[PDB]
Design a protein around this ligand. Structure first.
Ligand SMILES: NC(=O)c1ccc[n+]([C@@H]2O[C@H](COP(=O)([O-])OP(=O)(O)OC[C@H]3O[C@@H](n4cnc5c(O)ncnc54)[C@H](O)[C@@H]3O)[C@@H](O)[C@H]2O)c1
Ligand SMILES: NC(=O)c1ccc[n+]([C@@H]2O[C@H](COP(=O)([O-])OP(=O)(O)OC[C@H]3O[C@@H](n4cnc5c(O)ncnc54)[C@H](O)[C@@H]3O)[C@@H](O)[C@H]2O)c1
Ligand SMILES: NC(=O)c1ccc[n+]([C@@H]2O[C@H](COP(=O)([O-])OP(=O)(O)OC[C@H]3O[C@@H](n4cnc5c(O)ncnc54)[C@H](O)[C@@H]3O)[C@@H](O)[C@H]2O)c1
Ligand SMILES: NC(=O)c1ccc[n+]([C@@H]2O[C@H](COP(=O)([O-])OP(=O)(O)OC[C@H]3O[C@@H](n4cnc5c(O)ncnc54)[C@H](O)[C@@H]3O)[C@@H](O)[C@H]2O)c1
Lengths: 272, 272, 272, 272
């Protein structure tokens, strides 16, 4: 954006890097610090933010943390677990704040992350969508209220390549509701309905899963009664959703250097 | 309505009879002929159409076909298979046209019906919803066109007491599409998606089934591609949908006395 | 239901009375106390709850408060402002708790109500839908969070007889959001979009209004960004929604005799 | 794809060119002929289809029609009216078949196009979405059937930059329906509903317009009655929809060299 908190975007020609750039650009109060990328990169040294279209930006993609360690405040990393660990150890060093959206660490990789937080302020999360995280919070408000009277159904659609049903956001949704009811998902979940199934059992949570086309991700929780239903739906149209989520966090980091946070923290979902 | 085709509504204090009354009333060109009902009825002799609210109508519920055989042209029957057969034999007799929406005949009961048609004009159908029947026709237009490129998914929701999944309209939908593609439903249907399921197989038809609350019936067929999807949804809010369907047919009957028709005939779905 | 709090339902053959009966019946912990109705009633003395179908219930519709003042604890009133005032003065008298859903009082009628509360515990509200009231609460959580980044749109559909656009629940929704943002609805509302309108102004709230058929009421608030949108939709299928809302309140009343409450109170929306 | 009809994609690094490439690639029976682009291009001579990701394709972007006039059969043009005319005159010359999706010609530019068709087979259309074109056809089937009984409402949502309300697809929808009813859109359209509006007038068509976020385009026509509604919705997720539409047409062209067609022709909407 150009503003009071400057940022460097790790995996610059990543599907993630491309979109974080636009967001960095876009969002008030952040400014594009640096735009690193792999050494073997073609996009190296040259650029700016022109995968985020956005023509000439004046910050040029790179390959050394040292080259630019001076050109940003918060390190946004959507990379591969390998890089993050390098990034990690560097940021701890120069006390650089990070925002890790990289996934797939083993226990050792997480621990490293928990550890750095000791010295470094870190937002580390598996879903940076702001809509998704709010929704999960809302679902749990709703359940406290209607949960016991209502039939609660969860319906998700994704593209034709998604490989496990239900999706994890969907389970996540099942679980917030379930937990709001002191109950247990595994106890009341029903993922299939085929043939004669008999009338719906009270208190169970049903899942319905649609797979088609190019659908990025659509999740609705229905709280149904006699005479009404309440529905809370999230639709993702692009990966941009994660992007603004991380950048927003990048901005939230400014001013902290305690340890370890997530989107509840950034979002304050917990006082909502 | 008061108009050029007069009607008698068999099971007068039926959930069906109540709503057909309002429709008879409502719909231009039909007029409420008679309003029969069971002998043991409380509503007998007394009434009018005042289950259809509608205050005073001047036609009084009854119990004899002879009592009123002169007071209507088309016999609308949503009753029990037993009554319909009595009704049947009477209407054949006086050449009364019928509209049977009664369900649950065995082979012998159907045959009787096929037989009467010889002398009597009959609309006999298992779903009198006009929306549903149009939809089925549209689905099949759509499939000719997009069917081969697209992922085709069927999603139905019903109340918490519905006992087999998918619903029959849903299978019906599966089958029109399937048949439009020269294909066979049983060959490409998928009714469940649980756990690891792998990427979606091309050409299969997936079903997703929601059961909650008081939902009368909601059915959507999704034809999804990369970059778009086309959806054709029907929602039933009340049993009125069947009602106007039969009354409409009652009117369509006027002027025929050939045999045996259904909603494709009434609706001309076949030249659509 | 038969249980620990007994109830009398004012306008017994009202569209409201019929449905409250079923709810009283239905809902755990309440029991049908009495079923009053107008003197000139046909349904008088005779009945039970058999407008709520529900065959024989053992409580017989009436016309005197004295006749039954002993047969119930909480007075549920969905009547006409005239009756409520009579009802009012009686309940104050015998310290009967009320639940007023009657609408259309002038200032004097409200004041009477405020006044009785002094001695009598009263739930008095203009919308007893539980879904609607929760939703309004959720909308305001959502706005605190996404309100500033997002385009917020409100879309309502009602039947073809609804006479002012937007509906009042919709304005209500506009206003909770607006107020969550410290903002003012009248300042940022846009109710029409026709012709050339130019790009959407930031921070405005747009309303889109659908009128067709028999739609009881459907209200969705969309919080849209780049890459996602979050939607919170309420659908009413019947007047039953209000019914369970009042009965639920009837139960909430048990144990109070302070003054004056509403659905936030009953629902505790305020600690949600 | 690699197959029996070879194609060249005019504006190669266009938002359109990028997506047509993937489609050309994707779709069975077409093969990427050539990938032209402007002279001043950076992408020149070099490439393949690697804006369509898709790594190495073996066909290299260019700048001369002569350079490659031998390397393709059908000319797909999503360019600027200026280029199309050059393209035009060349294709007429070598009897190259075209598919023009370029927009913004004046009368003279169209005429040129009408004229070339004399010698050249051309698909020329303002909306290449297959879903949209089918939908329009379906809407008109539906209206013949339900049009007179039903309340018909049109609801479209687009992103926050769309500048005229309703969208043109929406009017287009209004007009197919209107015309199916022998009626006239301008006579029965209602684009706004604000304040007291009174009950809905029969036979009118209402439009409701949502503007928010990044919504590519969502259009639903609702045919509502008492007791049901039928909805036909199209959702665009990307510009890919147009892309497959043109490529599909490119394939449909194979074997013609008569004049002038559109998507009804390609799609055979007219015998549907
Ligand atoms: N947390 C969330 O909200 C969320 C959302 C989306 C993606 N992700 C995660 O984001 C990460 C990025 O995914 P993507 O789809 O953007 O991937 P992808 O397009 O494959 O790009 C990888 C990026 O990282 C760079 N890279 C790979 N290894 C590197 C190394 O050792 N050092 C430096 N740069 C390296 C690449 O050159 C490129 O910039 C993944 O770990 C993915 O699972 C997380
Ligand atoms: N075809 C469709 O579109 C469709 C739709 C809805 C219901 N149905 C069928 O409609 C029929 C009516 O259902 P309903 O829910 O209206 O039932 P219900 O409310 O139980 O009412 C039965 C009605 O038939 C009368 N009745 C029963 N046996 C009779 C007899 O022997 N002679 C004369 N009257 C007799 C009753 O007194 C009452 O009027 C059923 O067979 C149902 O399966 C069909
Ligand atoms: N607060 C909400 O959530 C909400 C929702 C729906 C309806 N309402 C209100 O509920 C009330 C009832 O509407 P309804 O549609 O049920 O009306 P309606 O069907 O007209 O019935 C009126 C009922 O009150 C009885 N009645 C009329 N005047 C009376 C009197 O002086 N004393 C005793 N009984 C009397 C009638 O005989 C019948 O029981 C109305 O004031 C309406 O505006 C409120
Ligand atoms: N018919 C439809 O279904 C439909 C749909 C989308 C876009 N369009 C039309 O597609 C066309 C392309 O839009 P776009 O968004 O892809 O535009 P845009 O990204 O601006 O790209 C223009 C493309 O044409 C090339 N170009 C411009 N002038 C040229 C010339 O004189 N000779 C050769 N190449 C030339 C550019 O270098 C680039 O390849 C526009 O006319 C647009 O209105 C039509």
């Amino acid at each position: 954006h150009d503003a009071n908190i400057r940022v460097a975007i790790a995996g610059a020609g990543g599907r993630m890097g491309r979109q974080l750039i636009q967001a960095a650009l876009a969002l008030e109060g952040v400014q594009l610090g640096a735009a690193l990328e792999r050494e073997g990169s073609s996009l190296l040294g040259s650029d700016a933010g022109e995968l985020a279209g956005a023509g000439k930006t004046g910050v040029t993609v790179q390959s050394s943390l040292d080259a630019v360690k001076d050109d940003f405040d918060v390190f946004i990393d959507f990379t591969r677990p390998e890089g993050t660990l390098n990034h990690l150890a560097f940021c701890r060093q120069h006390g650089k704040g990070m925002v890790i959206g990289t996934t797939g660490f083993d226990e050792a990789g997480k621990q490293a992350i928990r550890d750095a937080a000791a010295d470094i302020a870190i937002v580390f999360a598996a879903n940076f969508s702001v809509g998704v995280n709010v929704m999960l919070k809302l679902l749990e408000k709703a359940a406290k209220v209607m949960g016991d009277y209502t039939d609660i159904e969860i319906i998700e659609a994704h593209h034709r390549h998604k490989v496990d049903a239900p999706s994890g956001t969907a389970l996540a949704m099942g679980e917030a509701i379930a937990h709001a009811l002191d109950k247990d998902l595994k106890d009341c979940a029903v993922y299939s309905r085929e043939g004669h199934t008999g009338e719906r059992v009270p208190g169970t949570i049903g899942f319905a899963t649609v797979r088609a086309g190019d659908i990025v991700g659509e999740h609705t929780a229905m709280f149904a009664d006699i005479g009404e239903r309440l529905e809370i739906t999230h639709k993702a149209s692009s990966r941009m959703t994660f992007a603004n989520g991380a950048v927003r966090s990048a901005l939230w980091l400014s001013g902290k250097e305690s340890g370890l946070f997530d989107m509840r923290d950034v979002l304050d979902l917990n006082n909502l």
